[PDB]
């Protein structure tokens, strides 16, 4: 009873002391020598104008041209970024959609939200329409994120405090990741997809192992919910977006915080986080109605993407690093460059 | 300058735009009602009168409603309550037989205070239903109301006890100039509840129309 709690407190004490020992010099001291990125001025190359409600998620295709966006007008819309054309428009059974994924192969998209179901859509059908491939049921809370591993496996993040790994052909949870004590809000697959990170409402981020399904590491420091998470392109770090108006960079190997991306006159929480192809810019959509670009190695804010008339809810960077799409609670997605 | 295939792609996108716009027109004329309540507080009773989210569809006198029951969403409400910013009205159910069954009246009262004063529902009217009137009427005589609110200076009789509870709920509203509260005492189950919803919703519709026209 009390002995177990005392032993848990002892283990936490020992862990924090061990990860304090490894912290000899901060990231700022190491990167105090490189020239600043300067000023990053990005103009809106495209405005995508189809949605009729708040856009809650977008995902880029791996070809860096097609993207899918979800809004609560009940539509999944697949855009052609270059020409602004709408490739597909997918009517959702439940319009309470909070998340959106685009399969790495491009054959599928996934969708989920307040109906506790992740729905998989077959984009490339012999019948010329988009159909519901599989409805993945089994979560007892809303779906807050989903990310395809391949055409057959998808990891889902839920508000019932658990992440799950699914097997789309059968629909059964291959593995359930149960460590969190609050709603799990985001999700980021490692580049090699051997492992992933999740940010939850208990102000903690947990590093998982997809193969054997246990929480490898737990990263703390945020003062409120974590609404968005994203891996550094290296696969050895990630950045979290929290409601306490702060982004943080956590290192898997050093095993704690590296740098804090906050400013005094930013008081609103971050809704989205994404890195640039080099990992030198960190982009975070805020509740200021606008995105903010951060020099990830110096914490200096390098630019602002101010083109939205409501909260920036979703945000992504192409795999070639070429453009940034930001969706917002006004019904527009804007492509920057 | 466009290819034949690319012009056909643009034409397809225009048809997609047209259908999206049609769907938006068809959906903008649904009345979106968000049904709340502390626990089992007569919510099922009025759903009879009229997964994680349950949508109910019905039509009353040529008006189409949608009722979103989120009683099964047993997760942190602050992370999905903004999804409903923009509903026509909120139907809040309180089972006022539970003024002494634990405390639950106080829990319903904090839920009402949280929802009414929320920053997403600042112009969203609230249709406060006060259910289980009969059980409260033939229970207030035995168990006094003083168990719930000590400061109640009134006789243990139904017709003023219910008014006191209504007053305590309506005094939680800190937006008395942007949103209305339409209280209704409901245990008759005689199609009065949907009529009350229809009246409150038509008032909200007229006000929303005036907002849109700029007139307000």
């Amino acid at each position: 009873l009390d002995q177990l709690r005392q032993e848990a407190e002892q283990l936490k004490n020992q862990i924090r002391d061990a990860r304090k020992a490894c912290a000899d010099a901060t990231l700022s001291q190491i990167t105090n020598n490189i020239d600043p990125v300067g000023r990053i001025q990005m103009r809106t190359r495209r405005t995508l104008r189809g949605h009729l409600a708040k856009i809650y998620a977008m995902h880029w295709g791996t070809d860096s041209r097609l993207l899918v966006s979800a809004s609560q007008d009940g539509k999944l819309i697949i855009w052609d970024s270059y020409t602004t054309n709408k490739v597909h428009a997918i009517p959702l059974r439940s319009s309470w959609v909070m998340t959106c994924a685009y399969a790495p192969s491009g054959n599928y998209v996934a969708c989920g939200g307040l109906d506790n179901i992740c729905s998989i859509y077959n984009l490339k059908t012999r019948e010329g329409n988009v159909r519901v491939s599989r409805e993945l049921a089994g979560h007892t809370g809303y779906l807050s994120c989903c990310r395809f591993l391949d055409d057959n496996q998808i990891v889902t993040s839920s508000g019932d405090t658990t992440c799950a790994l699914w097997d789309i052909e059968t629909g059964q949870q291959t593995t359930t990741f149960t460590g969190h004590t609050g709603d799990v809000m985001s999700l980021s697959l490692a580049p090699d997809t051997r492992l992933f990170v999740s940010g939850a409402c208990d102000a903690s981020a947990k590093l998982w192992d997809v193969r054997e399904g246990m929480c490898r590491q737990t990263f703390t420091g945020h003062e409120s919910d974590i609404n968005a998470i994203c891996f550094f392109p290296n696969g050895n770090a990630f950045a979290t977006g929290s409601d306490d108006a702060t982004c943080r960079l956590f290192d898997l190997r050093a095993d704690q915080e590296l740098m804090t991306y906050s400013h005094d006159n930013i008081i609103c929480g971050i809704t989205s986080v994404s890195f640039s192809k080099s990992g030198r810019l960190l982009l975070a959509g805020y509740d200021d109605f606008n995105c903010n670009v951060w020099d990830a190695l110096k914490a200096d804010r390098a630019g602002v993407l101010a083109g939205h008339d409501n909260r920036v809810s979703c945000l992504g960077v192409t795999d070639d690093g070429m453009a940034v799409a930001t969706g917002s609670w006004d019904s527009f997605l804007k492509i920057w460059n | 300058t466009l290819s034949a295939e690319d012009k056909a792609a643009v034409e397809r996108s225009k048809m997609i735009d047209r259908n999206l716009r049609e769907d938006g027109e068809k959906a903008a004329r649904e009345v979106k009602l968000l049904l709340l309540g502390a626990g089992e507080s007569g919510k099922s009773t009025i759903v009879k009168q009229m997964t994680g989210i349950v949508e109910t569809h019905f039509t009353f006198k040529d008006l189409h409603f949608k009722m979103f029951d989120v009683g099964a969403q047993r997760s942190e409400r602050k992370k999905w309550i903004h999804c409903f910013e923009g509903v026509t009205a909120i139907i809040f159910c309180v089972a006022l037989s539970d003024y002494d069954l634990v405390n639950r009246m106080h829990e319903s009262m904090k839920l009402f205070d949280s929802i009414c004063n929320n920053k997403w529902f600042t112009d969203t009217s609230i249709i406060l239903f006060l259910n289980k009137k009969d059980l409260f009427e033939e229970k207030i005589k035995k168990s006094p109301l003083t168990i719930c609110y000590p400061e109640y200076a009134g006789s243990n009789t139904y017709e003023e006890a219910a008014a006191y509870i209504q007053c305590q709920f309506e005094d939680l509203n800190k937006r008395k100039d942007t949103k209305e509260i339409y209280t209704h005492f409901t245990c008759s189950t005689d199609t009065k509840n949907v009529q009350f919803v229809f009246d409150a919703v038509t008032d909200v519709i007229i006000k929303n129309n005036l907002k849109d026209c700029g007139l307000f």
Partner: single-chain antibody
Amino acid sequence: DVQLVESGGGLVQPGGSRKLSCSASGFAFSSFGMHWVRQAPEKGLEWVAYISSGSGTIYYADTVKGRFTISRDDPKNTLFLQMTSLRSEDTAMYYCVRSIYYYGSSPFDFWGQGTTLTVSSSDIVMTQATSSVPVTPGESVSISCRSSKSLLHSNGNTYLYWFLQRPGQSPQLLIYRMSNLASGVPDRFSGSGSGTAFTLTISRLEAEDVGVYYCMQHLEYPLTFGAGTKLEL
């Protein structure tokens, strides 16, 4: 079950009128642009008309424009060709071909089985110099097509298509935009070429690859076919 079945063909007196139908089945007919493609009894293919999805765009071959009318009944999933004043140059087998255009789609992918009409008695030119070539099974053969204009558009696409018409069979899409393999086409097919010069390569040719190979251009309307390279043995 994606079948398109044509009907309405038959022997018609010259100068008369006849209406062709194409009853779709097993696909979202309303989303597909639909073509009519013609083949004379001993000649290669020849595009005839095209009606868009939503009927908003219609095109005709200049040799039929004014005489022919293409139309569709989306509720009934039927595609129509109304032919008036049928000349002797209109004896042929008419094919109903579906084609859907969006980024990365595969136009001309499914072809009907065709109906036969017998009438009783500028434009890009696509060249297939080799009218026939003898091939042994297991061997590798390459078919060449040449264009009078650069098929490569400013957007990077090279609107060249390859179709195979096995004997006594309807044409089958092999390669769209000069490089992309159609679904269900074995990987031993491959298409390559610069502007105006194109090649289709069959590696380890085996039976049921014999037939006539057509090269079509989808860069501009009218769509024009090659004469056809025929493979035997």
